[PDB]
A and B are shown apart, each in its own frame.
Chain A
Amino acid sequence: ENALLRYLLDKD
C-alpha cells in the first residue's frame, strides 16, 4: 500500500 511510508514522510 505504501501508506505507512506516506505517513512517515509527511508527519511533522
Chain B
Amino acid sequence: ELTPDQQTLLHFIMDSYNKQRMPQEITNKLILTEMATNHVQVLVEFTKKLPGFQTLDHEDQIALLKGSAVEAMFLRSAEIFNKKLPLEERIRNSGISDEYITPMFSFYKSIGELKMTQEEYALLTAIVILSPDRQYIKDREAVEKLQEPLLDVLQKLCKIHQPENPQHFACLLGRLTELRTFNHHHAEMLMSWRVNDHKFTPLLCEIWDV
C-alpha cells in the first residue's frame, strides 16, 4: 500500500512531529497560559518544517498558521490529555461563559473517541495546517498542491489502522469540519474572557488575532 515516496514523507513528518513534545507540566494539569503558549511554540516549529512551507507566500504562511491554530490545539491537547490521564478542567473556574464550555468539550471528547494513532494525529494536523480553504489566502492552489500528498497518504493509513471500519478517514475529516464551524464562537469565547480585566501574552494575541 504505502510506497515509496509515501514512506520517506510519513517518516519525515513523524520525525518533525515527534521532536516537539510537552514537557513536565502534563502533571499539574495561570498555568493555562503556559500550556497555550507551549501549544503555539510547538505548532509553528512543526508548521515551518512541513514540506514546501518555506516556498509559500509570507502572508499566506501567517494566515495558514492563525487559521490552523484552534484545531491544532484541540488535536494536540487530545493526543496528550487522553493518553496521559489514561477531565479534570480548570476552565469553568477560569471565568469562561458556560455557553461556550459545554459545546467545546463535546468536540474534545469526540476527537478522543476517534481513537487516532500518532501517525494519524501527525498527518491530520498537517492537513489542518495546510488547509487551502482558510481566510485571506491568495495562492489557494500552491497550498492545495502541498496538501494532496499528505491526504492521499493519510487515506491509506486509515485503511491500515484499521480496515474493519471503512468510514474512519471520512469520520476523521468530519469531526474537523464539525470543529471548523466552532471557530467564530471561539473568537467570542476568548473576547468574553478578555472583558473582565484578564490579558493574554503577546504571542497569544498574535495567534488568535486579538
Contact = CB atoms under 8 A, between A and B. Distances in A.
Contacts, number: 26
A5 B58 contact: no
Q: Interface size for chain A: under 10, 10 to 19, 20 to 34, or 35 or more residues? A: under 10
B47 A9 contact: yes
Interface string B26-50: 0000000000000001001101100
A2 B62 contact: yes
A5 B202 contact: no
B130 interface: no
Contacts of B203: 4-5
B61 interface: yes
B62 A8 contact: no
Contact of B207 (A3, A5, A6, A9): A5
Interface of A: 1-6, 8-9
18 contacts: A1-B206, A2-B62, A2-B66, A3-B206, A4-B203, A4-B206, A5-B44, A5-B62, A5-B66, A6-B62, A8-B44, A8-B45, A8-B48, A9-B44, A9-B47, A9-B48, A9-B61, A9-B65
